Design a protein around this ligand. Structure first.
Ligand code: THP
Ligand code: CA
Length: 135
């Protein structure tokens, strides 16, 4: 897995943001995780959704540099969103959210699961510390 540079265009919510990648604007969806909904009416504004968005927004907006790391499987989903692990100054946003109890490990589709165990151990810690979603 190789990391690549990207430029923040705009954070949309907890697990989705728009980045300029290879000179092209794209919406990215964080791999292996799911932050609560704040958009789709079929779900509504789920508890901790606004919090997860604020965390992600803060994290990506304050970074000196952003990198995207694709897994080994497909790089986009059916909606055309780039599927990656996003890093803000070397810190993985996907793991950060799970560690704070602001996201649950979800959508694990082989072979795009290289970091599954790492995220699972962080989720177990958030759970034991009874953080946010796990409170
Ligand atoms: C994280 C991820 C989501 N998805 C899909 C599954 C869901 O399909 P459906 O929308 O048809 O349920 C949706 C979840 O994303 P959101 O959390 O952004 O809604 O995106 C993938 O296909 N692959 C992925 O790797
Ligand atoms: Ca979501």
């Amino acid at each position: 897995l190789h990391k690549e540079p990207a430029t923040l265009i705009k954070a949309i919510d907890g697990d989705t943001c728009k980045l300029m990648y290879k000179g092209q604007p794209m919406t990215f969806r964080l791999l292996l995780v799911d932050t609560p909904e704040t958009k789709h009416p079929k779900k509504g504004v789920e508890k901790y959704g606004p919090e997860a968005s604020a965390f992600t927004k803060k994290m990506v907006e304050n970074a000196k540099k952003i990198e995207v790391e694709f897994d080994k499987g497909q790089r986009t989903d059916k909606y055309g969103r780039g599927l990656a692990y996003i890093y803000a100054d070397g810190k993985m946003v996907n793991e950060a959210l799970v560690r704070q109890g602001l996201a649950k490990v979800a959508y694990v589709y082989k072979p795009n699961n290289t970091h599954e165990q790492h995220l699972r151990k962080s989720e177990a810690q958030a759970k034991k510390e009874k953080l946010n979603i796990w409170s």
